[model samples]
Target: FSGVVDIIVVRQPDDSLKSMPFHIRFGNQNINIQITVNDKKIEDVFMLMLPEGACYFPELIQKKLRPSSAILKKFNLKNGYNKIQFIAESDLQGKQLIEGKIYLYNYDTKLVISDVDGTVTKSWTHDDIAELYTNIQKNGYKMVYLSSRPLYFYNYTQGYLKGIIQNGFTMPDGPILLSPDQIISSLNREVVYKKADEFKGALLKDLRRVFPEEVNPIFAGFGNRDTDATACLYAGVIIDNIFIINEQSQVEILGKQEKSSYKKINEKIQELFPRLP
Candidate 1:
C-alpha cells in the first residue's frame, strides 16, 4: 500500500552498473537483498520482484527512524542483466511507483577502472577509445569510470562520449563512480589531489569484495596521475597494467610485470591471468 512510491534497493554484492553497481557479481554470484521504500524518505512497505519471478515483501527493521530501510532474504540473482520492478501493491501503487535492476556475473568478470579528470578527459588523443572499449568487452572486461566529480555530475560524466550524437567518441555503457564527499571536495579539486590515492585505493579495495579474490576479476586500471598509479598499485594491479596518460597526451603503460603479457595486450591478455598454486 502506498501514497507516493520509490525504492532504493541494493544487491548483496552489486558494484557497477549505470545507476547502482550495474552488476552485482560475486566470485560469480547472486545474493541476499535490501531496500528502502519510502515517500520523501519516510518508510513504507512494498513488494519486491525478484529475477526468479517471485514476490518479496521487504521487512522494515527500524520503524523509529525518519529515513528507513527494509531487508529481504536471499534473492536468486540470475547471470547477466535483469530488471526488477517495484510496485506499491495495486490501489496503493500510484503513478509514481519505481523499478530497479540487477545483473549477476559469476567468475570471469574482468574489471577495467579509468579515472575521469586527467585521464579520459584527454579524449582528444583517445579518439579511437571506443574501438578499444569494444575490444575490452569482446574479451569479457567491464569498465568502471572513476570520476572525482560529485554524484550530481554523474549524468554528465556517464554520458561523456555518447553526447557526440553521430560519430561521437562514445564510451561503453557502464556506471561511473562519483565522490560521495562534499561537492566542495570534488569541486575544490586540490583537496583530493594529494590524497586521491586514499580515496581511489579505498574504493578499489571495496570493489574487491564483490568481485572476489578467487577469480581475480580486477585486471587493469587507466589514469593520468601519480596518485592514480599509487592507488592502482595498492589495489593489486600490476604496474604495466596501470596505464597513465599525461598532459602532453602521451600514454605510458608503466613498469613490467613478471608474468604479465600486457606487451601483447594490443593483442589481449587471457594468456597472462596469474593463478594460485
Candidate 2:
C-alpha cells in the first residue's frame, strides 16, 4: 500500500504567454490538458501552497484562473486516487502554478551534552564553535538550541554567547526545547535517558540526512556518547574516520558500553558508510 504513486498536471498550449507560454507540471508522466479562459495576462493568479512532503488525494480537476480570488474551485481530488495536481489558467503574460504534496515522517536528531564541567550548560554550541557555524549560515541551515539544565538555569545557558550577535545560526522561529521532555515523551525514568546518555542506538538514519551534510557530524568532546556514535552510524559517517577526540577530562562512553551494542552500531555504520574499500 505504501508505494510511489505518480500523477501530473500538464497545461495545453492555450495561448497563455507569448514570451513564456504558461503551463504547470505535475504527475510522474506529466500529462497535458486544456482549460478554458486560458491566456497569459490574468490580473490576479495564485499558486496555492502546500506545506511539504508527498500525499495522496481523491479526484483532481483543473480550474480556470481567477483574478483577486482566494478560495479554490472547479478542481477537486477524488476518492481512491490520493496523489494528484490541479492547474489554473491566466491571461497573456503569466500563469501561476500551484502544487500539493504530502507524506509522513518522525525523523529527529539530538545532541546530549552532560555538562559536568560546569561551563554553563548550553544546548547549541554556537559561541564555542569556530568559523564552522558562520559558514553554515551562509549555506542556509537553521540552527536550534536545546539545553539539558534546569529551567532556572535557562538564561545561563541562553546567554552564554550573549554579546556576539549571531547572524546566521540563531534560534529557530518555531519550537525550542530547554529539556528532553520537549522531544521525548517521559523524561525522568525512561530508556530514552540511557539512549540520551548513550546518544546512539535510537537515532534514525534518515533523520541525519535532514541536516545539511557538513554540519551533522561535528559532535564535540562534551557529552557525545553511544547515541551520537549511533547517529553518526545512521548518517553513514565512517566509524573509522570518526577519529577519536577526547579532551583531558572527557571519556568515550560509547566505546565503554557493552561490546555487543557497540559492535552492532558499528556494523550499522559500515553498512551506510562503506565509503572505504
Candidate 3:
C-alpha cells in the first residue's frame, strides 16, 4: 500500500471499439499505436500495461488479419530512464494473437476523476471530501482530472472545480482535449464511438509504462453514450468494478439515480480491502 505507481487502465467500453487514440510522449519519446481495421481507424489502443499479468494495451490485443505491422517507435528515452518490452503471440495460422506479456518499470498510483459538472452536494461529496484528497495525497495518490469538455473551456471548468465547490481537486498537469480543439467526428453517432476508441485502451497503453498493477481494477465512471466504458472493455480491464455515474445525464449534476448509486465508490473500495476478504 505504500509504494510508487503510475499506470492506470480504463476498460469495458459499451460501444465495442471506441477509444481515444493517443501517441504518448515521455520527454522526446513517442509510441504510435491504434486499433484499426484494414487501415481504418477503429480504436486507439496503446502499448501500455495494466498490471503484472493483466495487459490492457489495445495495440497488442487485436490482430491484423492481412499483412500488417504495428510498429512502436521510441525516440530520446535515454535508455535507462524507461524500458518497454513486447511479448507477442500468434495463432496456429501465424495470425496476430491478441494476447501477450508486457513489463513496465517504476511508476506511481495516479488518481483520475471524470465528469465534473460543478455541483458537489451529493452524499459522496459530503464525507469530508476535500480531506479525502489531502488524505490521498498524504497516502501518495497523484490526481488527474479527466473530462469530455474541450480544452478551450478548461479555464472555466478548472477554475470552478478548484474553487469553493470542489476544493481545487488536483489541477490537470497534462493535456485536456477540448471540443473546439479536437478533431470532431463526421457523423453524430460515430463521434461517440470514435471518442470512446480514443480514450480507453490507448490511454491505458501509455499509462501502463508508469504504473503497473497486475490485479488492479480499471475504474471507469461515465455519464452516458458508452465511449469511456467501451474503450475500457476493449482493453480487457476488470468490468465488475466498473461504475457508470450517469448513463443518460443531460444536466451537469448527478441525478437522483446516479446520486443514490454513487455511494458505491466507497463500497467498492471497501470490497477491495475487506476486513475478512
Where model 2 places Cα greater than 4 Å from the true spot, the runs are 1-128, 162-227, 234-245, 248-277
Task: Estimate the TM-score of every prediction.
Answer: 0.58, 0.29, 0.38
Off by over 4 Å in 3: 1-110, 117-140, 164-201, 209-225, 247-260, 267-269, 272-277
lDDT of candidate 1 over 1-277, digit per residue (tens):
1111111122334332211222111110132323332222223334433443233333453211112212221233344444454333333333333344334454456678888787766644354456565556556677766777744444555556465332443467554564423222212245445545477775566565544455565688878788788878877788867777767666676875232222244445444333222
lDDT of 3 at 268: 41
- Candidate maximizing TM-score: 1
Better of 2 and 3 by TM-score: 3
In candidate 3 the C-alpha lDDT for residue 17 amounts to: 16
Q: Once model 1 is optimally superposed onto the true structure by TM-score, how far is the C-alpha of residue 277 displaced, in angstroms?
A: 19
lDDT by residue (tens digit), candidate 2, 1-277: 1111122121113311111111223221122222222232222323321122112121234322221112212222221112323343334323433432211111122222222212212323323332322333233332233334444444344345343344344322211123333223211226446545433323323224333344442232223334434545554544542322233323233434322222233344334223211
- Best first by TM-score, ranked: 1, 3, 2
* Candidate whose lDDT is highest: 1
lDDT tens digits by residue: candidate 3, 1-277: 1111111223222211111332121110122322322223333333432222222334345422111122211111211112222222223223222311111122323333343432122313443335433433344333344455543454555455555334444333322322212323222225345445465344444343323355333333333335545544544434542334343322212222333333334344444223211
